[PDB]
């Protein structure tokens, strides 16, 4: 269990999320993004270079923001149609 391994798995998972996102499978994408965020968070915890930590944090935040945008979109769409 190393930061590189965690990054590899995180990026795979976020790539999956992004594929589901593009496919408009937003509920599944939301879950997949957060799966990805778990591993980016683990990578962050085991990384000691402060520049690399901030790089990972910046990407974490980008994926977090997208996930929350999907969530808001899902909820608002449902509320509009209720």
């Amino acid at each position: 269990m190393s930061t590189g391994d965690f990054l590899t798995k995180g990026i795979e998972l976020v790539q999956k999320a992004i594929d589901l996102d593009t496919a408009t499978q937003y509920e599944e994408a939301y879950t997949a993004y957060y799966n990805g965020l778990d591993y980016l968070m683990l990578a962050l915890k085991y990384e000691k270079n402060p520049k690399s930590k901030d790089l990972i944090r910046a990407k974490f935040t980008e994926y977090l923001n997208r996930a929350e945008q999907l969530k808001k979109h899902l909820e608002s769409e449902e509320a509009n149609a209720a």
């Binding site: 269990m1 190393s2 930061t3 590189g4 990054l7 590899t8 990026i11 976020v14 790539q15 992004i18 996102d21 593009t22 085991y46 990384e47 000691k48 270079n49 520049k51 690399s52 790089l55 990972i56 990407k59 980008e62 994926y63 997208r66």
Partner: peptide, 21 residues
């Protein structure tokens, strides 16, 4: 367990994908 990865090295081995826009 812990690593001290240079950022330029991280970015060559790990290319972060961009979210849909």
């Amino acid at each position: 367990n812990y690593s001290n990865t240079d950022p330029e090295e991280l970015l060559r081995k790990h290319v972060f994908p961009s979210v849909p826009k």
